[PDB]
Write an enzyme that holds these catalytic residues in place. Structure first.
Site, PDB file in Angstrom:
ATOM      1  N   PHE A   1       1.177  -0.831   0.189  1.00 43.64           N
ATOM      2  CA  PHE A   1       0.181  -0.056  -0.043  1.00 43.64           C
ATOM      3  C   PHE A   1       0.930   1.532  -0.066  1.00 43.64           C
ATOM      4  O   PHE A   1       2.108   1.569  -0.240  1.00 43.64           O
ATOM      5  CB  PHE A   1      -1.161   0.489   1.429  1.00 43.64           C
ATOM      6  CG  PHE A   1      -2.833  -0.014   0.515  1.00 43.64           C
ATOM      7  CD1 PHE A   1      -2.891  -1.243  -0.295  1.00 43.64           C
ATOM      8  CD2 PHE A   1      -2.941   1.087   1.101  1.00 43.64           C
ATOM      9  CE1 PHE A   1      -5.041  -1.087  -0.408  1.00 43.64           C
ATOM     10  CE2 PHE A   1      -4.165   1.550   0.668  1.00 43.64           C
ATOM     11  CZ  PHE A   1      -5.200  -0.187   0.103  1.00 43.64           C
TER      12      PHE A   1
ATOM     13  N   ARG B   1      -3.010  10.475   6.503  1.00 45.73           N
ATOM     14  CA  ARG B   1      -3.884   8.608   6.465  1.00 45.73           C
ATOM     15  C   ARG B   1      -2.891   8.409   5.826  1.00 45.73           C
ATOM     16  O   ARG B   1      -3.211   8.648   4.538  1.00 45.73           O
ATOM     17  CB  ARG B   1      -4.810   8.898   7.588  1.00 45.73           C
ATOM     18  CG  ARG B   1      -4.967   7.724   7.632  1.00 45.73           C
ATOM     19  CD  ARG B   1      -6.279   7.100   7.911  1.00 45.73           C
ATOM     20  NE  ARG B   1      -7.391   7.682   6.360  1.00 45.73           N
ATOM     21  CZ  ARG B   1      -8.115   6.176   5.611  1.00 45.73           C
ATOM     22  NH1 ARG B   1      -7.317   5.391   5.962  1.00 45.73           N
ATOM     23  NH2 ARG B   1      -8.856   6.570   4.532  1.00 45.73           N
TER      24      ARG B   1
ATOM     25  N   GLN C   1      -8.341  14.761   3.394  1.00 42.36           N
ATOM     26  CA  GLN C   1      -8.298  13.388   2.532  1.00 42.36           C
ATOM     27  C   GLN C   1      -8.519  13.873   1.167  1.00 42.36           C
ATOM     28  O   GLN C   1      -9.594  13.268   1.447  1.00 42.36           O
ATOM     29  CB  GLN C   1      -7.481  12.241   3.194  1.00 42.36           C
ATOM     30  CG  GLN C   1      -6.997  11.513   2.135  1.00 42.36           C
ATOM     31  CD  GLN C   1      -5.733  10.418   3.020  1.00 42.36           C
ATOM     32  OE1 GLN C   1      -6.707   9.006   2.779  1.00 42.36           O
ATOM     33  NE2 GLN C   1      -5.173  10.333   3.031  1.00 42.36           N
TER      34      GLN C   1
ATOM     35  N   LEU D   1     -15.224   5.362  -5.303  1.00 41.74           N
ATOM     36  CA  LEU D   1     -13.739   4.801  -5.374  1.00 41.74           C
ATOM     37  C   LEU D   1     -12.873   3.744  -6.023  1.00 41.74           C
ATOM     38  O   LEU D   1     -13.719   2.978  -5.527  1.00 41.74           O
ATOM     39  CB  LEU D   1     -13.841   4.384  -3.558  1.00 41.74           C
ATOM     40  CG  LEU D   1     -12.189   4.602  -3.071  1.00 41.74           C
ATOM     41  CD1 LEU D   1     -10.695   5.432  -2.943  1.00 41.74           C
ATOM     42  CD2 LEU D   1     -11.831   3.656  -1.476  1.00 41.74           C
TER      43      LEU D   1
ATOM     44  N   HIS E   1     -11.916  12.334   0.031  1.00 41.13           N
ATOM     45  CA  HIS E   1     -12.349  10.430   0.883  1.00 41.13           C
ATOM     46  C   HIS E   1     -12.221  10.642   2.703  1.00 41.13           C
ATOM     47  O   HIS E   1     -13.588   9.719   2.802  1.00 41.13           O
ATOM     48  CB  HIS E   1     -11.076   9.958   0.675  1.00 41.13           C
ATOM     49  CG  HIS E   1     -10.632   8.394   0.634  1.00 41.13           C
ATOM     50  ND1 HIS E   1     -12.273   7.464  -0.491  1.00 41.13           N
ATOM     51  CD2 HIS E   1      -9.978   7.898   1.310  1.00 41.13           C
ATOM     52  CE1 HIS E   1     -11.877   6.977   1.040  1.00 41.13           C
ATOM     53  NE2 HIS E   1     -10.793   6.622   1.053  1.00 41.13           N
TER      54      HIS E   1
ATOM     55  N   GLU F   1      -6.249   2.074  -3.243  1.00 41.43           N
ATOM     56  CA  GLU F   1      -5.451   2.231  -3.375  1.00 41.43           C
ATOM     57  C   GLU F   1      -4.765   1.048  -4.377  1.00 41.43           C
ATOM     58  O   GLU F   1      -3.984   0.612  -3.922  1.00 41.43           O
ATOM     59  CB  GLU F   1      -4.880   2.446  -2.681  1.00 41.43           C
ATOM     60  CG  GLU F   1      -3.500   3.597  -2.795  1.00 41.43           C
ATOM     61  CD  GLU F   1      -2.502   4.276  -1.401  1.00 41.43           C
ATOM     62  OE1 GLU F   1      -3.294   4.134  -0.273  1.00 41.43           O
ATOM     63  OE2 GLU F   1      -2.612   5.543  -1.924  1.00 41.43           O
TER      64      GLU F   1
ATOM     65  N   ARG G   1      -0.560   9.911  -0.304  1.00 45.07           N
ATOM     66  CA  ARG G   1      -2.068  10.412  -1.208  1.00 45.07           C
ATOM     67  C   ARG G   1      -1.495  11.980  -1.425  1.00 45.07           C
ATOM     68  O   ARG G   1      -2.151  11.903  -2.132  1.00 45.07           O
ATOM     69  CB  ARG G   1      -3.687   9.827  -0.277  1.00 45.07           C
ATOM     70  CG  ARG G   1      -3.357   8.115  -0.417  1.00 45.07           C
ATOM     71  CD  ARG G   1      -4.741   7.601   0.049  1.00 45.07           C
ATOM     72  NE  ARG G   1      -5.034   6.614   0.855  1.00 45.07           N
ATOM     73  CZ  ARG G   1      -5.952   5.943   0.971  1.00 45.07           C
ATOM     74  NH1 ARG G   1      -6.818   6.846   1.817  1.00 45.07           N
ATOM     75  NH2 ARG G   1      -6.411   4.876   0.801  1.00 45.07           N
TER      76      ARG G   1
ATOM     77  N   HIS H   1      -7.982  10.992  -2.060  1.00 47.15           N
ATOM     78  CA  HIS H   1      -7.489  10.020  -2.513  1.00 47.15           C
ATOM     79  C   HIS H   1      -7.484  10.312  -4.276  1.00 47.15           C
ATOM     80  O   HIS H   1      -8.243  11.138  -4.387  1.00 47.15           O
ATOM     81  CB  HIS H   1      -8.837   8.677  -2.413  1.00 47.15           C
ATOM     82  CG  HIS H   1      -8.649   7.881  -2.515  1.00 47.15           C
ATOM     83  ND1 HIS H   1      -8.541   7.057  -4.079  1.00 47.15           N
ATOM     84  CD2 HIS H   1      -7.762   6.486  -1.532  1.00 47.15           C
ATOM     85  CE1 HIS H   1      -7.489   5.769  -3.737  1.00 47.15           C
ATOM     86  NE2 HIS H   1      -7.661   5.701  -2.183  1.00 47.15           N
TER      87      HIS H   1
END
Ligand code: FAD
Ligand code: 3PE
Ligand code: HEM
Ligand code: UMQ
Ligand code: TTF
Ligand code: OAA
Ligand code: SF4
Ligand code: F3S
Ligand code: FES
Ligand code: K
Ligand code: MG
Lengths: 612, 139, 240, 102
Positions: free
Chosen positions: A121, A399, A242, A254, A355, A257, A288, A244
């Site tokens: 990730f 995050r 945030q 979405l 997001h 990721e 991100r 995304h």
């Protein structure tokens, strides 16, 4: 008066039935507490069910790992705004938390050894950022949140938790700085309910619906954080929103990721994998906030994709089709429904999309809500918070992916453990006043019969387009100030509200009007704190203040440097207050906790340059 | 704080005494061929059982025996087209129920449950019903 | 340049004493609307009639809130494409054979209580090691859960089954039954026999006559009809 | 015993397959053995089948007992009449051939 009020008495009350709300709910019942769970939706409808990527934990199933490496990733990912003592607790409990979920029956993907499958990730590495890409994102294909929430809901059926499904919490019952419970409306029969309890847990999710284009559900309206604002208590770091990187073009759904974690790459109009230029090491698996800013520059310069040149492509067809069906079956169906794209032949059009909300109700690492008076933190008695609605703060200014689902269960369990070691079940329920929560009913009745000039949907769209154009990925002083004077004008225009449904049973016109009041309170503190914060940290990028302002110039040896006063640097949490009558926003600040739970066990990470 | 059986009892307790309406179902739902073939299998099944029962009651109550009524019909000298239509109408429900009964027995083994396979097996039953009925009626 | 699409939507108000169900017609311009039916319902509520009531949340077909009967079939409004044929009017009804709370909002309390009766959670004989180590499960034993764990509990299948219409009080329905099967073949569960013996009655399972409306209408592409048949095979072969 | 529901479901499928095998047997080997076998199979298969229809569409303790009691009477008279026809008349297999020769 006009509304039949029903009083309840419990040991604890949990507002919210998402990932964090469920874990705190039956955790209290498991400890022997008569617990009530109040939720405006059926538990499995909460936004946690839409989570795709996975949940981070240093299980060591793919290679040798260490939770202190995950600790370093989160601290660097937060851009040194997160509280390292809360990050310590979350990353250390991460293996035991995921094991608890699998032992509950969660159908995690499996390896050749029979253990939980983990993928890579964004923003994760080994050897404290020196040993290459890490693989600690435990996932159920790409439906991790769907299975996490359904597993938690099934487990909650084994305890005597008194559920109150489709109840809309209005305000907190406060008395002498302590929380006495909550007051809510029963959507089914239209009756007012007052829940009295010694402790209250707020897990109401985020407020992604303040923007025009978001990945969040229609019910992510920040109702719990608005109740905190109306109680006179502050909210923390709301200006850190945030974006995304890969949200599908148009509907905003979405695209996980995990696509880039399995081998997916981003290309522009010239087919260039441009992330190799912005992040030579992390490539498409950077943080991100970095990937989103990189995509935005490629579009505004003139290398976008599509007919309008307003997005870019997410290439996946270079991967074997078996891996696409086994690892990413969810987005393969979503890319076909909301774009008509076959991932095995054509890339997915994506763009940065609102997001996740890093900010929220400020808490300590135990889940206790805190206030800040005269430079010291004070635990608000009887009030807790966990999940996206809370600010531990483990995420800080940015995050990392798959860290939120971890937050949900780790700090949802922390709230139940803290209450169990503080209070005893069956203790006397704190009495209230015979008129507690009467202003909540007076507001609901006023909106129920509102016959003004601006309808609720007309005012919500003005708020969303204001946030979308004034508080976007890149921000500046002049544009942020123009958005502040608009939202304050919009908030004053709430006196002209008009509703049409005069009923009380399932009056979604009335319910969505209450959510507009909640969305506006979150939108005011978000954009006002963004205008005041004159620096660039994490997801908050100021094109007029492009540098990160810490107490020291950490880009040089600190030997012989003068420390910047607390009122002259910006490495500090933003605390916001709102006078709900007029709508004025008051801002104060508190220092960032740099200590851990044990220096010998986990060393504190000093601030340094942040690159991927 | 409420068990599943308590929640079920409370459901029917508060709904049967309320003024809530029941949403429409049979009068609004879109029909399909497998759905229409499901009720036809039940319709032919019941019709065949009532035919066996009527024939069983006739054997116990009619003053004459079966060979007598055959000669009565054979003496009326009915047209071969009418005789063919009567034989077809009697063998059609038996033929349909028999083939679709085999279709049910295959399902009871867990085979052919894909929606496209359900459509294929249903169409196969329809053509076999016509072929079997037309051939037997032509004897 | 407007492309007017007509929608006829079931309406009923519980706060109006003596109100009878009715069908109200709306006109929506498809050029200024989203491609999905839920986008038309949200557009109607925001602009034409704020009294229209319906459940919605994820608008991406994962939460299962917007389950309703569109054009005669149960589906998710957020994933159902709007019929661009402007000559016919799309009819929208609540889930069939359900007590209507208001407009397009049915009462799913019995559906939820039935899902609780099958105990949809992992059960082991030696649960004294809960939370110590991860249980082992091969890739092949994990593949058996594919096509079962993706159920979003929208109740589109159960509200389409005629057997669930007539015997919904005691017949569990395809949604609950497939989840009961999801826990029967989980290699980590140790109560497979007890879950089978729960269905040893004329109604809970054996009201299924393989009508297969459930598999046709599932918005997730699942096959609850096939799962019921695998339960029946297990019911006739297991020994005590 | 404790598996009364699943055993009844298995017995239904066994009688259906048995009744399915009697159709070619009635054409290939017509006689008293198939006549009485058809009498037993048609009665049992039809009695259990109509019982499923009652279970689905009849509700209430009293209406259920009345419908099920009448079904026993209907099935009892049906099997008795078929056995009468096979002993005192030409039988099932012969009656069908005589009907088709019209
Ligand atoms: C949007 C999103 C987020 C997301 C993700 C995918 C999407 C599309 N994928 C993730 C992932 O792969 N890994 C990960 O770590 N995180 C991922 N996220 C973010 C994450 O899912 C969310 O931050 C998290 O799920 C939030 O959970 P939480 O339990 O904090 O809140 P919720 O699940 O959104 O549910 C909120 C509950 O509160 C109740 N509520 C709200 N208002 C009220 C009122 N007024 N009264 C009573 N109850 C209320 C709701 O009913 C709901 O149950
Ligand atoms: C439905 C009504 C009965 C339908 C019968 C279908 C078959 C009719 C037929 O053509 O049978 C012919 C068969 C042979 O006779 P034949 O053609 O003369 O040839 C002799 C040399 N093999 O004749 C025979 O040898 C007997 C073979 C058929 C036996 C069938 C027994 C079961 C019938 C169940 C019927 C249940 C429903 C009854 C409905 C009507 C009630 C009045
Ligand atoms: C002469 C026959 C009679 C009088 C008869 C009667 C019936 C009846 C009344 C039913 C109940 C229908 C329902 O419950 O929907 C039924 C069902 C059934 N029949 Fe027959 N039947 C005959 C021939 C056959 C044959 C030759 C086969 C092969 C067969 C296979 C089945 C099966 C498998 C069912 C079960 C239907 C279900 O489970 O939904 N039948 N029959
Ligand atoms: C004697 C026994 C007679 C049995 C048959 C009696 C007549 C039944 C007529 C009912 C036909 O009903 C019709 O069935 C077809 C095929 O399932 C359906 O078609 C369905 O599958 C097709 C093919 O995948 C799809 O294109 C279509 O969108 C779908 O609705 C159609 O929507 C329905 O309108
Ligand atoms: O109960 C029905 C039919 C039914 O309700 C419908 F006609 F579809 F409405 C059936 C039971 C077995 C085969 S059809
Ligand atoms: O928010 C996260 O943790 C990551 C996420 O949604 C995803 O891309 O799957
Ligand atoms: S099975 Fe398919 S239709 Fe029935 S509930 Fe689960 S998802 Fe909705
Ligand atoms: S819709 Fe109904 S009866 Fe059986 S297979 Fe599907 S459940
Ligand atoms: S709104 Fe979540 S499924 Fe349609
Ligand atoms: K947060
Ligand atoms: Mg004004």
């Amino acid at each position: 008066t006009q509304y039949p009020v029903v009083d309840h008495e419990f040991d604890a009350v949990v507002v919210g039935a998402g990932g964090a709300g469920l874990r705190a709910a039956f955790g209290l019942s498991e400890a022997g507490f008569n617990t009530a769970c109040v939720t405006k939706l059926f538990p499995t409808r909460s936004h946690t069910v839409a989570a795709q990527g996975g949940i981070n934990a240093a299980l060591g199933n793919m290679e040798d790992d260490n939770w202190r490496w995950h600790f370093y990733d989160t601290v660097k990912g937060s851009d040194w705004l997160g509280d390292q003592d809360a990050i310590h607790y979350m990353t250390e409990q991460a293996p035991a938390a995921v094991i608890e979920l699998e032992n509950y029956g969660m159908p995690f993907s499996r390896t050749e050894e029979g253990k939980i499958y983990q993928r890579a990730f964004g923003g994760q590495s080994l050897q404290f950022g020196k040993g290459g890409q890490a693989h600690r994102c435990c996932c159920v294909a790409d439906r991790t949140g769907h299975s996490l929430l359904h597993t938690l809901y099934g487990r909650s059926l084994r305890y005597d938790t008194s559920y109150f499904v489709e109840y809309f919490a209005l305000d907190l019952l406060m008395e002498n700085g302590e929380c006495r419970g909550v007051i809510a409306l029963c959507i089914e029969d239209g009756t007012i309910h007052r829940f009295r309890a010694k402790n209250t847990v707020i897990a109401t999710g985020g407020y992604g619906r303040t923007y025009f284009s978001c990945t969040s559900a229609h019910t992510s309206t920040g109702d719990g954080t608005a109740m905190v604002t109306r109680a006179g208590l502050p909210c923390q770091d709301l200006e850190f929103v945030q974006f995304h990187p890969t949200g599908i073009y148009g509907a905003g759904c979405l695209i996980t990721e995990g696509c880039r974690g399995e081998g997916g790459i981003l290309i522009n109009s010239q087919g260039e994998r441009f992330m190799e230029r912005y992040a030579p090491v992390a490539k498409d698996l950077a943080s991100r906030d970095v990937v989103s800013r990189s995509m935005t520059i490629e579009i505004r310069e003139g290398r976008g994709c599509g007919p309008e040149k307003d997005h870019v492509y997410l290439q996946l067809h270079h991967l074997p089709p078996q891996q696409l069906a086994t690892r990413l079956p969810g987005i393969s169906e979503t890319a076909m429904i909301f774009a008509g794209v076959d991932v095995t032949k054509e890339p997915i059009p994506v763009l940065p999309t609102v997001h996740y909300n890093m900010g929220g109700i400020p808490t300590n690492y135990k889940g206790q809500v805190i206030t800040h008076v005269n430079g010291e933190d004070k635990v608000v008695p009887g009030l807790y918070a966990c999940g996206e609605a809370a600010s531990a703060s483990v995420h800080g200014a940015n995050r990392l992916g798959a860290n939120s689902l971890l937050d949900l269960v780790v700090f949802g369990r922390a709230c139940a453990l803290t209450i169990a070691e503080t209070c005893k079940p069956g203790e006397p329920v704190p009495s209230i006043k015979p008129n507690a929560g009467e202003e909540s009913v007076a507001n609901l009745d006023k909106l129920r019969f509102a016959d003004g000039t601006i309808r609720t949907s007309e005012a919500r769209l003005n708020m969303q387009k204001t946030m979308q154009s004034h508080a976007a990925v890149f921000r500046t002083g002049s544009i942020l100030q123009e958005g502040c004077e608009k939202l304050s004008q919009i908030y004053r225009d709430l006196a002209h509200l008009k509703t049409f449904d005069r009923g009380i049973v399932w009056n979604t016109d009335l319910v969505e009007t209450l959510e507009l009041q909640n969305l506006m309170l979150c939108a005011l503190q978000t954009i006002y704190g963004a205008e005041a914060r004159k620096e660039s940290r994490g997801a908050h990028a100021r094109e007029d203040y492009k540098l990160r302002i810490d107490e020291f110039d950490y880009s040089k040896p600190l030997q012989g440097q003068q420390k910047r006063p607390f009122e002259e640097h910006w490495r500090k949490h933003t605390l916001s207050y709102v006078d709900v009558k007029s709508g004025k926003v008051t801002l104060k600040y508190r220092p960032v906790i740099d200590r851990t739970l044990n220096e010998e066990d986990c060393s504190s990470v000093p601030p340094a340059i942040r690159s991927y | 704080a409420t068990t599943a059986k308590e929640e079920m009892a409370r459901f029917w307790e508060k709904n049967t005494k309320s003024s809530r309406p029941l949403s429409p179902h049979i009068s609004i739902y879109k029909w399909s061929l497998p759905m229409a073939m499901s009720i036809t299998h039940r319709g032919t099944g019941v019709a065949l059982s009532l035919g066996v029962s009527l024939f069983s009651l006739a054997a116990l109550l009619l003053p004459e025996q079966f060979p007598h009524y055959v000669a009565v019909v054979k003496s009326l000298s009915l047209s071969p087209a009418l005789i063919y239509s009567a034989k077809f109408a009697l063998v059609f429900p038996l033929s349909y129920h028999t083939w679709n009964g085999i279709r049910h027995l295959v399902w009871d083994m867990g085979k052919g449950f894909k929606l496209s396979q359900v459509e294929q097996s249903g169409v196969v039953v329809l053509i076999l019903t016509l072929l079997s009925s037309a051939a037997i009626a032509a004897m | 340049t407007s492309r007017i699409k007509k929608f006829s939507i079931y309406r009923w108000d519980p706060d109006k004493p003596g109100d009878k169900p009715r069908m109200q017609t709306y006109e929506v311009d498809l050029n200024k609307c989203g491609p999905m039916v839920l986008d038309a319902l949200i557009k109607i509520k925001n602009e034409l009639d704020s009294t229209l009531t319906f459940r919605r949340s994820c608008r991406e077909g994962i939460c299962g809130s917007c389950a309703m009967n569109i054009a005669g079939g149960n589906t998710l409004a957020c994933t159902k494409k709007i019929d661009p044929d402007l000559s016919k009017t799309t009819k929208i009804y609540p889930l069939p054979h359900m007590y209507v709370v208001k407009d397009l909002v049915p009462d799913l309390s019995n559906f939820y209580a039935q899902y609780k009766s099958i105990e949809p959670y992992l059960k082991k004989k030696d649960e004294s090691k809960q939370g110590k180590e991860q249980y082992l499960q091969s890739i092949e034993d994990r593949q058996k859960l594919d096509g079962l764990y993706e159920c979003i509990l929208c109740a589109c299948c159960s509200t389409s089954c005629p057997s669930y219409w007539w015997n919904g009080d005691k017949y569990l329905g395809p949604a609950v039954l497939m989840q009961a099967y999801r826990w029967m073949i989980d290699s980590r569960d140790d109560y497979t026999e007890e879950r089978l013996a729960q269905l040893q009655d004329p109604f809970s399972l054996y009201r299924c006559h393989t009508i297969m409306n459930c598999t046709r209408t599932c918005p997730k592409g699942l096959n609850p009809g096939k799962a019921i048949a695998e339960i029946k095979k297990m019911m006739a072969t297991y020994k005590e | 015993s404790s598996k009364a529901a699943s055993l009844h479901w298995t017995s239904e499928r066994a009688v259906s397959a048995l009744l399915l095998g009697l159709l070619p047997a009635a054409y290939l080997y017509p006689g008293p053995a198939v006549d009485y076998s058809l009498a037993a199979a048609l009665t049992l298969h039809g009695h259990w089948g109509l019982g499923q229809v009652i279970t689905d569409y009849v509700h209430g303790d009293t209406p259920i007992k009345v419908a099920n009691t009448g079904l026993y009477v209907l099935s009892a008279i049906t099997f008795t009449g078929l056995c009468y026809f096979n002993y005192y008349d030409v039988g099932i297999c012969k009656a069908v051939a005589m009907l088709w020769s019209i």
